[PDB]
Amino acid sequence: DEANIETNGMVPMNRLTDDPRWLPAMSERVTRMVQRDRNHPSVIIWSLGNESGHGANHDALYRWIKSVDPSRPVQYEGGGADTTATDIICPMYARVDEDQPFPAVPKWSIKKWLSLPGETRPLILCEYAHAMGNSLGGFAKYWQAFRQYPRLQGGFVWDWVDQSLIKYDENGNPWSAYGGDFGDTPNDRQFCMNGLVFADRTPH
Amino acid sequence: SGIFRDVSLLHKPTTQISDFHVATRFNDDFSRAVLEAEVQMCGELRDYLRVTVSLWQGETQVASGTAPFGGEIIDERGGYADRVTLRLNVENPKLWSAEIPNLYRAVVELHTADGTLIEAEACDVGFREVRIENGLLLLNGKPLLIRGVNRHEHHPLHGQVMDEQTMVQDILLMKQNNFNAVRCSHYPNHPLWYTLCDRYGLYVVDEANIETNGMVPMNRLTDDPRWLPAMSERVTRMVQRDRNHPSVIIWSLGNESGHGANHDALYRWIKSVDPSRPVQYEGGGADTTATDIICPMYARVDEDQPFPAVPKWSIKKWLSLPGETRPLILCEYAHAMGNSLGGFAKYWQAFRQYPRLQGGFVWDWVDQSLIKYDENGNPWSAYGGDFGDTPNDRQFCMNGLVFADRTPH
Numbered sequence: 001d002e003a004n005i006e007t008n009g010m011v012p013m014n015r016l017t018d019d020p021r022w023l024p025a026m027s028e029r030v031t032r033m034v035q036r037d038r039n040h041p042s043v044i045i046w047s048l049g050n051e052s053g054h055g056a057n058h059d060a061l062y063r064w065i066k067s068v069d070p071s072r073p074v075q076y077e078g079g080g081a082d083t084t085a086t087d088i089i090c091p092m093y094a095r096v097d098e099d100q101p102f103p104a105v106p107k108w109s110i111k112k113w114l115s116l117p118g119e120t121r122p123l124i125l126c127e128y129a130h131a132m133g134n135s136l137g138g139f140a141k142y143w144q145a146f147r148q149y150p151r152l153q154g155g156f157v158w159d160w161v162d163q164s165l166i167k168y169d170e171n172g173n174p175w176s177a178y179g180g181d182f183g184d185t186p187n188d189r190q191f192c193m194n195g196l197v198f199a200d201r202t203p204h
Numbered sequence: 205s206g207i208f209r210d211v212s213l214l215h216k217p218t219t220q221i222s223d224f225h226v227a228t229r230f231n232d233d234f235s236r237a238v239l240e241a242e243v244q245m246c247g248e249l250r251d252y253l254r255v256t257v258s259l260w261q262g263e264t265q266v267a268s269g270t271a272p273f274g275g276e277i278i279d280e281r282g283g284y285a286d287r288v289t290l291r292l293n294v295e296n297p298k299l300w301s302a303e304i305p306n307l308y309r310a311v312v313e314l315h316t317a318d319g320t321l322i323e324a325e326a327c328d329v330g331f332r333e334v335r336i337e338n339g340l341l342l343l344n345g346k347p348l349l350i351r352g353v354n355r356h357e358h359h360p361l362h363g364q365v366m367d368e369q370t371m372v373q374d375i376l377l378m379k380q381n382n383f384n385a386v387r388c389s390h391y392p393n394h395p396l397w398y399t400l401c402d403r404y405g406l407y408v409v410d411e412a413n414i415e416t417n418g419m420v421p422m423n424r425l426t427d428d429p430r431w432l433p434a435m436s437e438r439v440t441r442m443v444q445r446d447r448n449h450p451s452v453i454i455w456s457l458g459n460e461s462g463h464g465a466n467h468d469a470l471y472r473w474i475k476s477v478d479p480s481r482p483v484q485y486e487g488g489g490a491d492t493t494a495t496d497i498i499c500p501m502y503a504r505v506d507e508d509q510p511f512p513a514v515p516k517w518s519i520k521k522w523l524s525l526p527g528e529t530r531p532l533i534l535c536e537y538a539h540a541m542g543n544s545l546g547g548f549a550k551y552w553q554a555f556r557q558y559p560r561l562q563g564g565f566v567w568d569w570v571d572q573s574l575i576k577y578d579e580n581g582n583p584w585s586a587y588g589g590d591f592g593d594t595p596n597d598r599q600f601c602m603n604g605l606v607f608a609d610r611t612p613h
């Protein structure tokens with residue numbers, strides 16, 4: 001269960017989340033979600049949000065949940081996926097064998113990540129296997145790694161269903177549309193479609 | 205068998221230096237150190253005796269200290285009236301490493317207060333710290349990448365007798381081929397070996413002469429207290445002899461003798477007597493309580509070999525097993541028997557990518573073939589069985605990177 005907090009577009013990504021002036025609004029997005037959903041057995045982990053860098057606010061909120069509901073681990077990928085705000089190493093798109101040593105927020109090979117000096121947590125990717133169009137190449141490589149390594153505990157594929165929207169043609173026939181198709185601009189064109197299934201649930 | 209090491213006669217005064225131990229500790233960034241030399245004597249104690257320990261960098265004496273015997277208070281009964289510890293400060297010491305084997309000379313003099321020498325002992329001193337921190341083996345604070353090899357003491361004509369020339373030849377070839385470390389498989393070596401390592405610069409794993417491979421199960425003797433005494437002397441006498449060599453950076457409890465309680469006891473003894481060097485031991489699955497380093501033999505890079513009780517996990521996988529935090533350095537890998545070393549690069553690529561994979565010791569340096577002569581006196585290399593020995597293990601004695609005469613494979 002994930003809080004409704006995403007500040008992907010700020011520069012740097014944690015501009016708002018490291019700002020105490022934004023702590024109050026953030027705080028409610030986390031607290032009110034916990035108050036609402038805490039009794040559902042299906043919810044096994046709480047998440048602080050998504051792509052909002054790593055700021056102090058995340059740290060305060062992580063601690064709040066640990067206090068109020070010790071029954072579920074808290075995870076958060078921002079700022080490098082292994083910050084002090086997460087109980088689980090939960091990278092997005094880290095590869096199996098190949099390291100991607102980006103500065104500040106490297107995405108190490110998942111096998112290598114587990115064993116960096118002092119690292120002890122389990123690794124579960126918050127997103128992997130971007131199923132955009134004709135994709136899923138290399139899916140097997142992950143599964144093999146997950147089965148071999150106790151601490152590699154799986155992941156969440158990105159994602160379930162294409163976010164395409166129906167439009168109608170001149171003769172009123174329906175067709176699947178993506179970004180830019182509504183005159184919207186700027187837009188990110190087909191990036192909205194990354195699912196294992198078509199919008200109508202027919203599988204890819 | 206036989207008397208295969210040197211024989212000598214040593215004359216000592218009745219009042220003599222019976223032991224001395226040298227240690228070097230440092231500040232955080234190694235720009236300061238303190239050398240501590242504990243000296244013990246035998247013979248009659250006299251208030252006029254003194255010990256002076258002086259440290260030299262080449263021709264220059266950089267530090268010196270003198271004191272009468274009488275160590276500090278140890279317990280309710282007092283201290284050692286027969287020992288003394290001198291402490292010398294050293295600013296910006298030149299550090300020892302296999303890259304730059306800088307050495308100083310420590311001279312221990314037993315003499316009278318008025319200046320008359322009774323006797324002098326001495327050793328080469330390498331200022332270096334060995335420690336494992338945060339899961340990594342550090343030397344002078346930097347993480348090592350062990351380019352090692354296991355080396356037996358073997359000569360094709362002379363058997364197990366070692367000579368200076370052969371040892372230097374081996375060292376030069378090792379360095380020339382990019383090795384920086386050597387494991388004493390699987391016994392203390394001829395004394396000169398250490399001197400050469402100290403001076404030419406190689407990291408050394410000094411290993412107790414204990415291997416009970418053929419027992420069933422392997423730890424049958426090592427888990428038996430009745431064998432604790434004998435094993436104990438193979439460990440303790442090694443430390444007492446070699447503890448002052450800076451090239452020795454890790455002590456080893458022996459090899460292929462399973463994991464038994466005697467090993468835990470001896471692991472602890474070393475930890476207690478010489479905290480300056482990690483202790484490793486592979487028996488019993490390579491990650492027991494008697495080892496500071498996960499030190500498997502022949503574990504593969506990616507492939508697991510889940511043998512019961514003593515699995516050999518893929519090294520990459522091993523490091524991250526739940527709760528595992530130690531560095532991993534294979535005590536033996538890349539078995540070079542015959543036309544071999546296939547897959548070598550695979551290990552190097554892993555070592556470079558994983559911080560806690562800190563290398564390994566190839567098995568092994570030199571083919572243990574022996575020379576035989578045909579009817580015309582022409583020599584040929586022989587292996588197991590060629591002397592009428594039986595049973596025997598045939599060519600398994602030949603696993604080196606180099607042929608017995610030092611020609612490379």
Ligand SMILES: CC(C)S[C@@H]1O[C@H](CO)[C@H](O)[C@H](O)[C@H]1O
Pocket residue numbers: 097098099109553557
């Ligand atoms: C993109 C590569 C250089 S990453 C490279 O792949 C290898 C396979 O060839 C190994 O498995 C290594 O772990 C990995 O670093």
Ligand SMILES: CC(C)S[C@@H]1O[C@H](CO)[C@H](O)[C@H](O)[C@H]1O
Pocket residue numbers: 092127191192194
């Ligand atoms: C395209 C990258 C620069 S951002 C990348 O975009 C994806 C688009 O489907 C997802 O939204 C990922 O979560 C996001 O990290």
Ligand SMILES: CC(C)S[C@@H]1O[C@H](CO)[C@H](O)[C@H](O)[C@H]1O
Pocket residue numbers: 229230231232236237238
């Ligand atoms: C080689 C020494 C100067 S290190 C010196 O030791 C001190 C204790 O004697 C303290 O630990 C200092 O912090 C340390 O730098």
Ligand SMILES: CC(C)S[C@@H]1O[C@H](CO)[C@H](O)[C@H](O)[C@H]1O
Pocket residue numbers: 501536600601603
């Ligand atoms: C042959 C194996 C069952 S034991 C194997 O034999 C090798 C022969 O070179 C080495 O002696 C290894 O240390 C030993 O484990």
Ligand SMILES: [Mg+2]
Pocket residue numbers: none
């Ligand atoms: Mg000489």
Ligand code: NA
Pocket residue numbers: 145146147148149150151152153154
């Ligand atoms: Na797993």
Ligand code: NA
Pocket residue numbers: 186187188189
């Ligand atoms: Na666009």
Ligand code: NA
Pocket residue numbers: 191192193194
């Ligand atoms: Na998308």
Ligand code: NA
Pocket residue numbers: 554555556557558559560561562563
């Ligand atoms: Na490494």
Ligand code: NA
Pocket residue numbers: 595596597598
């Ligand atoms: Na045989």
Ligand code: NA
Pocket residue numbers: 600601602603
């Ligand atoms: Na052999």
